[PDB]
Amino acid sequence: DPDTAVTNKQSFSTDVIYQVFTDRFLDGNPSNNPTGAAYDATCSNLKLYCGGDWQGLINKINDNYFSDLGVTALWISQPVENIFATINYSGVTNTAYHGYWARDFKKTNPYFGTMADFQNLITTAHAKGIKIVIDFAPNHTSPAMETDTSFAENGRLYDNGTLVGGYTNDTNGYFHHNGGSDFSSLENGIYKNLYDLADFNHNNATIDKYFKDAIKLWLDMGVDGIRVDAVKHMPLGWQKSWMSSIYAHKPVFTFGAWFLGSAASDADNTDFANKSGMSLLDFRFNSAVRNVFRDNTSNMYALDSMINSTATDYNQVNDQVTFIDNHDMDRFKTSAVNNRRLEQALAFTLTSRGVPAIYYGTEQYLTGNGDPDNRAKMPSFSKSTTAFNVISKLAPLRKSNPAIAYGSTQQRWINNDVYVYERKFGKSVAVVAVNRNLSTSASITGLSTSLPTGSYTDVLGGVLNGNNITSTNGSINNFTLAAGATAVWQYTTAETTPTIGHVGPVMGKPGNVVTIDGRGFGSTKGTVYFGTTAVTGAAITSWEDTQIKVTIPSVAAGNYAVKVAASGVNSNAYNNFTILTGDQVTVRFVVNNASTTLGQNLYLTGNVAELGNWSTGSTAIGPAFNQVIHQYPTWYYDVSVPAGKQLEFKFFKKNGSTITWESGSNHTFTTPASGTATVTVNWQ
Ligand SMILES: OC[C@H]1O[C@H](S[C@H]2[C@H](O)[C@@H](O)[C@@H](O[C@H]3[C@H](O)[C@@H](O)[C@@H](S[C@H]4[C@H](O)[C@@H](O)[C@@H](O[C@H]5[C@H](O)[C@@H](O)[C@@H](S[C@H]6[C@H](O)[C@@H](O)[C@@H](O)O[C@@H]6CO)O[C@@H]5CO)O[C@@H]4CO)O[C@@H]3CO)O[C@@H]2CO)[C@H](O)[C@@H](O)[C@@H]1O
Ligand SMILES: [Ca+2]
Ligand SMILES: [Ca+2]
């Protein structure tokens, strides 16, 4: 199928996601509504259930609300069964309407629908070309108190009805009993409770297996993507292992939520996006956009700076999910924020790199500050707002123009209030001009672009006061950009030479099937390169002009570049593809008596690519932890490592550029065939 079809579960670059709180959208079936105190028919007390369900989503898909809006994917609340109990937090009654208080990841939330309703949602969605993305929260169950089992449901977990265990009397150690996190460090936030939510101990073999089994269930039902909640509060190692099991079974686009407060680069965040096997919600992009269009605390330069900085930090910037707001912050729209600014932020987001997501109601200019006010009921289904118009005209461009879906970004003109950028991919180009100044127009002179000679019409049709331009070999004739204007000019044409636009997933073991999207691959089965290794014939399960499904060859584990050769012509190289040694398992490495010097950290490396292949650089594992599970001078770290393999490893201390290794022989350990394990050694 073409890279743009609904069947492409590995790439969302050509899509526009619509994030919706299932309970706050449409109550299509009042028969499944909760009873009593947990329900509010008027939906005025936003902490209670309002009745929204999967039937309501089905209805709006059938009457073409989403089709006319232009969205091609739906991101819904966690579908799993949540606790039924009601919780009173200092006077106010709270319910699990948000879906984050799971109790059984193998059953559906009765209030949203049955297992059958869910299947019906998938079918109905796919029939109209809409992908379904689900929220999944494997970090915890629900609120719990160890001393009081009568609080909520004591964070109890069920395996399709069968009780696995609760927070109190957790003899098996399914959860962490290290208190609540104070967010003082990364380690503190991973092994301690997120508020009062019972934290899972993924090192426990049962919990590890439970989540691999539980996710397969939903993948088997046809979900096209996964939004992993609180990725910053679970070990990267376990998550990478979990991700490889997903990719070996049914690869789907997966991204996580790692909260960031500014557009500033964050080392840990960058590492996660580059090493976990999944991408992230682009909080840096979000901050810049809000600072510039909403809050007026930054100018266009901050926007351009962020575009360049993020493109440099993330290996695959096109996999990051962008947005102007969501359930974790104030609604973009405020009384002090103009409609045009909201509209410009949307246009910018929809034409920029990454995978754009729209929080439900944005098209209706919904207001609401903080939790829960920002999760109000959908006020209307009108298709007449300007914002609705902008989305319907720009969203389709991600499918029709590869420059917008896979292209690079270059600044063509800029000043405090004006920004003109260019998206380019092969011969296809897209140019967007934005003037955030609401009162004064701007005279643009000396603008150059890659647009071929010709006359260009504003894709928006002037709804955002856009204008038409004339290109003379890229040189655009002088023009006036109206106050608060924003225009989109583009040019698309067929590509003759092979060009890779996206590869998904970007991690896997030999035998897994990866998807290569792009242009000009031709219909004749060619050859795929993973470094220097050529992959041909049967190994290439599918080959079309815009997409190539290929099997990962049995080469040495490591970092590889991917190229495609069609009719003797070599395409561009898609860098940083990770090939694993084989199936993964999470192992906790513990080392005793590793006393260090001020500012000196402990790292780990060994004889497999997953351990860095004896490297002491960015591929080495670390820095190790030393506060929560084990205390200094004992260090520890959870690492995704190959299953059933004899490993050789050593720890090393690194302060500045001085590296001091362990003496003696290398430590050895044979990893288990599956699950988890703990290996403890003494510093030599
Ligand atoms: O005693 C403390 C506290 O007790 C309760 S809080 C109570 C709340 O009243 C309920 O509404 C309910 O809240 C749940 C919420 O409704 C659900 O949607 C989820 S939220 C989920 C987030 O989506 C996810 O992002 C993450 O949380 C992240 C935050 O979103 C993000 O902003 C930051 S928090 C960061 C702040 O920005 C800073 O301002 C500063 O405070 O430092 C903070 C450091 O993190 O990062 C977070 C983690 O990445 O995870 C949450 C958890 O699911 O669940 C909510 C919790 O269930 O339930 C809570 C308690 O369970 C009292 O009501 C309150 O007054 C009191 O302060
Ligand atoms: Ca209902
Ligand atoms: Ca945790």
Q: Domain tally for the chain?
A: 4
673 and 575 share one domain: no
Q: What is the resolution of this structure in A?
A: 2.4
Last residue of a domain, one of 400, 435, 468: 400
- 483/465 Cα distance (integer angstroms): 8
Which atom number of ligand 1 is nearest to the Cα of residue 261? 37
Q: Is 560 left (phi over 0), alpha (psi -120 to 50) or beta?
A: beta
Q: Which atom of ligand 1 is nearest to the CA of 327?
A: 23
- With beta carbons less than 8 A apart as the criterion, state whether 645 and 553 touch: no
Cα–Cα distances in Å, from 271 out to 163, 443, 618?
Answer: 37, 42, 9
Give the binding-site residues of ligand 1, using a 6 Å CB cut-off: 89, 94, 98, 100, 143, 183, 194-197, 230, 232, 257, 259, 328, 371
Residues 39 and 159 occupy one common structural domain: yes
Order of strands across the sheet with 475-476?
454-456, 469-472, 475-476
Q: How far is the CA of 141 from the centre of ligand 1 (A)?
A: 14
Which of 494, 513, 545 lies at the terminal end of a domain, its last residue?
494
Residues 484 and 517 in one domain: no
Task: Indicate whether 385 and 454 sit together in one domain.
Answer: no
Residue numbers of the domain that contains 113: 1-400
| 203, 303: one domain | yes
Query: Which of 132, 134, 112 lies closest to 27 in space, CA to CA?
Result: 112
Pairing type for strands 676-682 and 584-592 reads parallel
Rounded Cα–Cα distance for residues 98 and 115 (Å): 19
**Dihedral sign for Cα atoms in the order 325, 331, 333, 336:** negative
How many Å lie between the centroid of ligand 3 and the Cα of residue 306? Answer: 30
- What type of residue sits at position 186? L
User: Residue 236 CA: which ligand is closest?
Assistant: 3
Among residues 602, 588, 607, the alpha carbon closest in space to that of 652 is found at 602
Residue 268 sits in the same domain as residue 351? yes
605 and 509 within one domain: no
Does residue 575 sit in helix, strand or coil?
strand
Q: Which ligand is nearest to the CA of 138?
A: 3
Dist CA 494 CA 490 (whole Å) = 14
Spacing, Cα 630 to ligand 1 middle (Å): 27
At 255, the amino acid letter reads F
Q: What is the CATH number of the domain that holds 115?
A: 3.20.20.80
Assign 8 to helix, strand or coil: coil
Q: What does the DSSP assignment read for 385-432? A: SHHHHHHHHHTTHHHH-HHHHH-EEEEEEE-SSEEEEEEEETTEEEEE
Q: Look up tokens 């939903």; give the residue.
A: 218
User: How does 503-519 read in b/e, with b if 16+ C-beta sit within 10 Å?
Assistant: bbbbbbbbebbbbbbbb
Q: Which of 21, 93, 100 to mutate to test the pocket of ligand 1 (most atoms within 8 A of CB)?
A: 100
Q: Are residues 364 and 338 in the same domain?
A: yes
Residues 6+ apart with CB under 8 A from 86: 37, 38, 93, 94, 95
Candidate from 328, 329, 359, 373 with most ligand 1 atoms within 8 A of CB, to mutate: 328
- CATH at 640: 2.60.40.10
Run of H or E including 535? strand 533-535
Residue 157 sits in the same domain as residue 210: yes
> Of the candidates 562, 556, 683, which has an alpha carbon nearest to the alpha carbon of residue 632?
683
Ligand with minimal distance to 283 CA: 1
CA distance 109 to 81: 4
Are the C-beta atoms of 267 and 611 separated by less than 8 Å? Answer: no
Approach to solving: X-ray
Residues 6+ apart with CB under 8 A from 292: 298, 299, 300, 302, 303, 436
Assess whether 446 and 527 both reside in one domain. no
Q: Are residues 341 and 454 in the same domain?
A: no
288-292-298 Cα angle (round to 5): 85
Cα separation of 281 and 555, whole Å? 32
- Both tokens assigned to 468: 């038409």
CA of 306 to the centre of ligand 1 (A): 27
Taking CA atoms only, the protein residue closest to ligand 1 atom 40 is 183
Asked if residue 197 and residue 107 are part of one domain, the reply reads yes
| C-alpha closest to that of 487 among 400, 419, 388 | 419
Closest C-alpha to ligand 1, atom 43: 183
Are 421 and 307 in contact by the 8 Å Cβ rule? The answer is: yes
With 0-12 CB in 10 A as exposed, 13-18 as middle and 19+ as buried, what is 565?
A: middle
Q: How far is the CA of 664 from the centre of ligand 3 (A)?
A: 36
Burial of 159 (0-12, 13-18, 19+ CB in 10 A): middle
* CATH code at position 418: 2.60.40.1180
Last residue of a domain, one of 559, 580, 601: 580
- Nearest ligand by distance to the CA of 55: 2
